[PDB]
Amino acid sequence: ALGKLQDVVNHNAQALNTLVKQLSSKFGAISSVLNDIFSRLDPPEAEVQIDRLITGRLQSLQTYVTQQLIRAAEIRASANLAATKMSECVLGQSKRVDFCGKGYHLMSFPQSAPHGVVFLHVTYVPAQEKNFTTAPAICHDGKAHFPREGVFVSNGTHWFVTQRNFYEPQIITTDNTFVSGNCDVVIGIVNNTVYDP
Amino acid sequence: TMSLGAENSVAYSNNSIAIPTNFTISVTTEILPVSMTKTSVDCTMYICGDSTECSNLLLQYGSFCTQLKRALTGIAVEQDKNTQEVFAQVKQIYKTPPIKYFGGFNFSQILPDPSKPSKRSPIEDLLFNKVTRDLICAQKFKGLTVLPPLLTDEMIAQYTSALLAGTITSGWTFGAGPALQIPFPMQMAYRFNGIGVTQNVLYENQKLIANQFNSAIGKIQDSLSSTPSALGKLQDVVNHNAQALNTLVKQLSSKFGAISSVLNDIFSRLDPPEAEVQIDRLITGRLQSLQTYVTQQLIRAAEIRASANLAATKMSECVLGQSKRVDFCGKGYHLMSFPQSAPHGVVFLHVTYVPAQEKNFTTAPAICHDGKAHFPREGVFVSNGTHWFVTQRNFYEPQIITTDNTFVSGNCDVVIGIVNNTVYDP
Amino acid sequence: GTGVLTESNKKFLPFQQFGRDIADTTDAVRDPQTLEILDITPCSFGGVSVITPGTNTSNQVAVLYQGVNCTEVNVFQTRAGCLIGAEYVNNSYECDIPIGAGICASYQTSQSIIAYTMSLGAENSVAYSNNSIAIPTNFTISVTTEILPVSMTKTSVDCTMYICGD
Ligand SMILES: *[C@@H]1O[C@H](CO)[C@@H](O)[C@H](O)[C@H]1NC(C)=O
Ligand SMILES: *[C@@H]1O[C@H](CO)[C@@H](O)[C@H](O)[C@H]1NC(C)=O
Ligand SMILES: *[C@@H]1O[C@H](CO)[C@@H](O)[C@H](O)[C@H]1NC(C)=O
Ligand SMILES: *[C@@H]1O[C@H](CO)[C@@H](O)[C@H](O)[C@H]1NC(C)=O
Ligand SMILES: *[C@@H]1O[C@H](CO)[C@@H](O)[C@H](O)[C@H]1NC(C)=O
Ligand SMILES: *[C@@H]1O[C@H](CO)[C@@H](O)[C@H](O)[C@H]1NC(C)=O
Ligand SMILES: *[C@@H]1O[C@H](CO)[C@@H](O)[C@H](O)[C@H]1NC(C)=O
Ligand SMILES: *[C@@H]1O[C@H](CO)[C@@H](O)[C@H](O)[C@H]1NC(C)=O
Ligand SMILES: *[C@@H]1O[C@H](CO)[C@@H](O)[C@H](O)[C@H]1NC(C)=O
Ligand SMILES: *[C@@H]1O[C@H](CO)[C@@H](O)[C@H](O)[C@H]1NC(C)=O
Ligand SMILES: *[C@@H]1O[C@H](CO)[C@@H](O)[C@H](O)[C@H]1NC(C)=O
């Protein structure tokens, strides 16, 4: 589960272990021990054999720094995303899908972690859906009535208006339905009766 | 001297407002690399060419024959995760219904075609045709090979067909939770409602918006083809890899201080103690050339991962839901997005609401009636010269000022620029 | 050097003995004692990829060759190479070990390393009608988790002790 927090640890361990093992590899020299080269040789030749190791170790140390620069950019990218997900998910309710958890984002709780952070996204996932008959508008006296906030549903016999994310029927009234034009242009309009308080 | 565009001068007054009277649905394209070409090198073929003594001296060096392969392996897995985090944002593979009548829209170029034996949409046919001893075999005989991707073009095609069969038949309810069916005419009415416009514009102009949409998809088929360089950012990632692999096979014939570049000639003219001196010049040099390739591939994978993560965001915020981020999902008021597969990338077809045919009016912050101010609840107070009406902000719709769209908060002595009128009450 | 010696269909002019490629490597040569033209091609090579469920369940392993058509090494030939050690089953499941080209291997049931085509999930056709909307009746509050790294371990090397040790 905390696999992407151990990957940065394993990469750093692998980097700190691939750099020390090269201290026992003859980079074209007679031996890896510096004392053996300085002892069992003469000054002019020793300055040639010690030159093949001082160069093969500078390339290894430079390889470590280059790899630590490309890897830090990956960490900086994950750090900017974590900072963004601690302000859009924690410091407020985001409306970006899949950004703060899968589903409708409600809230999030940040928790510390070794060399990282763990978000707990509380999401809103609907369930137990059904099947209803819908309609764009409803003609009552000649003009079309569109849902102000909701969707027109029908249970086979009657017509109601419910929310778009939770079933809650209410009688159709003139307080949640606005009129716009006549019943001649809307394709799929049904005939019903709107209530007036 | 390059011009920065035309010099337009937008008029600015105290009582002037420009409300558009029409709309122009435009479908743009967006190209983004989501993958690369997984490569694998061999230490005992690039450094040592068919030589047995060279393999002995290569083991005498450090660990530069397993950290390079492990680094290229991490790239390969990374290029297999980018295509698994973007085209696999849905668990279920939704399918299109047999009857294809979505209110009047013609989803015939983005939906897969059963006739051709490849299960690709008409738009996804010119994308795979423009983005394309030979060189592919010459590099193989030098130790440089190419690994086949995990997800084939067939699996990516049906992956883009599940994100396109739920966006049209379920809307944005198939990325959050359970896929909820909804008629498409009622889907373009809740997407037209998240841009300020009301839903009484679509139901009164459905045939017009259906013709503009069909006329905008038919141009994408021609735009991508007619354009000299349209799928160029998908070819730059291919040319960069077709250049680093060619700049690496050309360093096997460049001596770095030896008598020649052929390893089979240094051992046939020199005994074995001067050879070891001249072979470390054709091994250490070739090790740095192979290391420079891996170093540039890591920087290359860092640019593809950024575009891959950006593609995952534009396929979960433009396709799995309507976004309110300007310039993010196209150019304009975002309405829909259809993912189109492509070689080592994806093509986003953003549908943007673009207002047009704007006309000037006379605006006012609030109106005064019965000794109290009236502010617009949702809209703007415009005037045609003699009468005052309340209209929307993204579309013109003259409506009388009733006591159902104005709230009274304050008096007519605090707002600067308050006109006088008669607030009708029902 | 090593390699396979086969006849060539080239048109070597009678003043050219050797022959190179786009990598400046001998791809052809003229035999002096017969005056012919051979096509020097490198002997068969490739890669080895061992598939292992782990040394916690069993010791059975599958050998995946790269670049072979099962004729230059239960045998299976995929687009990546010859997979020797696994059988290709028909019913598809979720991927367990990525082999390539849409093929994965798992240690399922007897216990042997089976091979199958990747399954991108189940199929769920959404009934689309002209007036049919699905409104949810209940809610299910869920809590997920996202493990994002923030920082890495800081390091500092001695450039006078690592290179020269005492
Ligand atoms: C529809 O709902 C109304 C009000 O609850 C009820 O009286 C009627 O019987 C329902 N019809 C069906 C078939 O469910
Ligand atoms: C609906 O009303 C229209 C206009 O009055 C009328 O033409 C039509 O017959 C009505 N349909 C039904 C089903 O009542
Ligand atoms: C708005 O009114 C102020 C004060 O009369 C005036 O100075 C300003 O120029 C006006 N702006 C325009 C261009 O209508
Ligand atoms: C809006 O633009 C379309 C396309 O140009 C045109 O067919 C239609 O007549 C225009 N409608 C208005 C309100 O002018
Ligand atoms: C959709 O467009 C294609 C290509 O122009 C055409 O062949 C087809 O008849 C159109 N379908 C509909 C229903 O308009
Ligand atoms: C302004 O609108 C009113 C009501 O529609 C109309 O009677 C009047 O003639 C219009 N005047 C102009 C100048 O358009
Ligand atoms: C509105 O009416 C008041 C009271 O008659 C008057 O003082 C004010 O100047 C009027 N304003 C306008 C815009 O005519
Ligand atoms: C010797 O070489 C010449 C030139 O290739 C060839 O014509 C001749 O047949 C060869 N003779 C033998 C003994 O192989
Ligand atoms: C392997 O050989 C068969 C011979 O029929 C051929 O059809 C197939 O394409 C070859 N595959 C590869 C990987 O070359
Ligand atoms: C919707 O109406 C059209 C035109 O009558 C028809 O072709 C289509 O099959 C209908 N769809 C369904 C399943 O209601
Ligand atoms: C909603 O789901 C919860 C958890 O399964 C259950 O306890 C509750 O009774 C359900 N309520 C409805 C409206 O069915």
Nearest to C7 by CA among C43, C26, C31, C33: C31
Alpha-carbon radius of gyration of chain A: 35
Q: Distance between CA C14 and CA C104 in Å, rounded?
A: 54
Side-chain half-sphere exposure of B165, counting CA atoms within 13 A: 25
Q: What are φ and ψ of residue B348, in 5° steps?
A: -100, 125
Nearest-angstrom CA–CA distance, A22 and A57: 8
Q: Whose structure tokens read 């995303």?
A: A81
Cα end-to-end distance, chain B, whole Å: 63
Interval between CA C65 and ligand 2 midpoint (Å): 73
Inform me whether the C-beta atom of residue B77 falls under 8 Å from chain A C-beta atoms.
no
Handedness of CA A14, A19, A20, A25 (dihedral sign): positive
The answer to whether C63 and C85 have CB atoms below 8 angstroms apart is yes
The pair phi, psi for residue B349, each rounded to 5°, is -105, 90
* Structure-block tokens of residue C39: 């096509």
Give the helix ranges, DSSP H, for B30-180: 43-46, 53-59, 67-86, 123-130, 135-138, 153-165, 173-176
Cβ within 8 Å of residue A181, ≥6 positions away: A143, A144, B200, B204
Q: How far is CA B8 from the centre of its chain?
A: 31
For residue A113, list its beta bridge partners: A116
Q: How far is the CA of A142 from the centre of ligand 4 (A)?
A: 26
Q: Which residues 330-359 on chain B approach chain A with CB closer than 8 angstroms? A: none
B322 Cα to chain A: minimum distance (Å): 9
Length of chain A: 197
Q: Which helix (H) or strand (E) holds C50?
A: strand C47-51
Question: In angstroms, what is the C-alpha Rg of chain B?
Answer: 31
Sequence-distant (≥ 6) Cβ neighbours of residue B211 within 8 angstroms: none
Q: What is the DSSP letter of B9?
A: -
Asked if the Cβ–Cβ distance from A9 to C139 is below 8 Å, we say: no
Give the number of other CB atoms < 10 A from CB of residue B121.
Answer: 22
Q: How far is it, in rounded angstroms, from Cα A87 to Cα A118?
A: 14
| Residues B393, B326: Cα–Cα separation, whole Å | 17
Apex B315 CA angle, B205 and B230, nearest 5: 85
Q: How far apart are the first and last CA of chain A?
A: 58
Q: Which ligand is nearest to the CA of C142?
A: 11
Centre of ligand 4 from the C-alpha of residue B208, in Å: 8
* Among the listed residues A50, A28, C41, the one whose alpha carbon sits nearest the alpha carbon of residue B273: A28
Amino acid at B75: I
State residue A177 phi and psi, 5-degree precision: -135, 125
Cα–Cα distances (Å) from B56 to B16, B61, B229, B283, in that order, read 85, 10, 50, 12
How many residues are there in chain C? 166
Consecutive H or E run containing B289: helix B284-313
Q: Which two tokens stand for residue A135?
A: 């309609």
Of B167, B170, B320, nearest in space to A164 by CA: B170
Q: Are the C-beta atoms of residues B368 and B418 closer than 8 Å to each other?
A: yes
Angle at B295 between CA B289 and CA B301, to 5 degrees: 135
Cβ-based neighbours of A52, under 8 Å, separated by 6 or more: A27, A28, A29, B280
Structural method: cryo-EM
Beta bridge partners of C98: C104
Residue C157 sits at the chain A interface (C-beta within 8 Å): yes
CA C5, CA A141: separation in Å to the nearest integer?
93
Hey, how many other C-beta atoms are within 10 angstroms of the C-beta on C142?
Answer: 16
**Quick one: which of B141, B124, B125 has its CA closest to B133?**
B141
Distance A192 CA to ligand 2 centre (A): 10
CB C98 to CB B88 under 8 A?
Answer: no
d(CA B310, CA B306): 6
Give Cβ neighbours of residue A29 (< 8 Å, ≥ 6 apart): A37, A49, A50, A52, A53
What's the Cα-to-Cα distance from B211 to each of B203, B312, B333, rounded to whole Å?
Answer: 14, 31, 19
Burial B16-32 (b: 16+ CB within 10 A, else e): ebebbeebebbbbbbbb
Ligand in nearest proximity to the CA of B210: 5
Partners of A124 in beta bridges: A104, C141
CA–centroid distance, B367 to ligand 7, in Å, is: 10
**Euclidean distance between the first and final Cα of chain C, in Å?**
45
> How far are the Cα atoms of B62, B65, B114, B275 from residue B278, in angstroms, in the given order?
18, 20, 63, 5
Contact with chain A for residue C131, Cβ under 8 A: yes
Which residue, among B96, A155, B233, has the nearest Cα to C135 in the 3D structure? A155
* DSSP secondary structure letter of residue C34: T
C-chain residues near A64 (CB < 8 A): 157
**Long-range contacts, A161-169 (Cβ 8 Å, 24+):** A162/C135, A163/C135, A164/B190, A164/C135, A165/A104, A165/A124, A165/A126, A165/C136, A166/A126, A166/C135, A166/C136, A166/C137, A166/C139, A167/A130, A167/C135, A167/C136, A167/C137
In the numeric block, which tokens belong to residue B31?
Answer: 């190209």
Cβ-proximal residues to B325 (8 Å cutoff; 6+ apart), any chain? B317, B334
Q: How far apart are CA B220 and CA B31, in angstroms?
A: 13
Task: Give the experimental resolution in Å.
Answer: 3.2
Query: From the CA of A174, how many Å to the nearest CA of chain B?
Result: 11
Amino acid at C142: S
Q: Is B284 in the pocket of ligand 5 (CB under 6 A)?
A: no
Sequential DSSP letters for B14-25: SS-EEEEEEEEE
Among the residues of B87-232, which ranges form H helices?
Answer: 123-130, 135-138, 153-165, 173-176, 184-191, 206-226
Burial A38-58 (b: 16+ CB within 10 A, else e): eeebeeeebeebbebbeebbe
Say if C120 is an interface residue toward chain B (CB within 8 Å): yes
Distance from CA of C115 to the nearest CA of A (A): 26
Residues C89, C116 contacting (CB under 8 angstroms) = yes
How much of chain B is in helix, strand and coil states, percent to nearest 5? 35, 15, 50
Could you tell me if C101 and B140 are in contact, meaning their C-beta atoms sit under 8 angstroms apart?
no
Q: What are the DSSP calls for A41-77, one per residue?
A: S-HHHHHHHHHHHHHHHHHHHHHHHHHHHHHHHHHHH
- Specify the long-range contacts of residues A168-171, CB closer than 8 Å, at least 24 apart: A171/A195
- Rounded to 10 deg, the angle between the A43-85 and A3-18 helix axes is 170
- Say how far apart CA B392 and CA A175 lie, in whole Å: 19
Mutate to test the interface with A, among C132, C146, C154, C158 (most CBs of A within 10 A): C146
Structure tokens at C12: 């070597």
Please choose, from the candidates B219, B222, B190, B188, the residue with its C-alpha nearest in 3D space to the C-alpha of residue B205: B188
Is C31 within 8 Å of C38 (Cβ atoms)?
yes
Residues C142, B176: contact at Cβ < 8 Å?
no
CB count, 10 Å around CB of C137? 13
Which chain A positions have a beta carbon within 8 Å of C146's beta carbon? 85, 101, 118-119, 121
Q: Do A21 and B62 touch (CB under 8 A)?
A: yes
Spatial contact of B120 and B164, defined as CB atoms under 8 Å apart: no
DSSP state letter for B402: B
Burial letters B48-74, b for 16+ CB under 10 A, else e: bbbbeebeebbeebbebbebbeebbee
Contacts of B136 (CB under 8 A, 6+ apart): B146
Q: Which residue has the tokens 């309710």?
A: A93
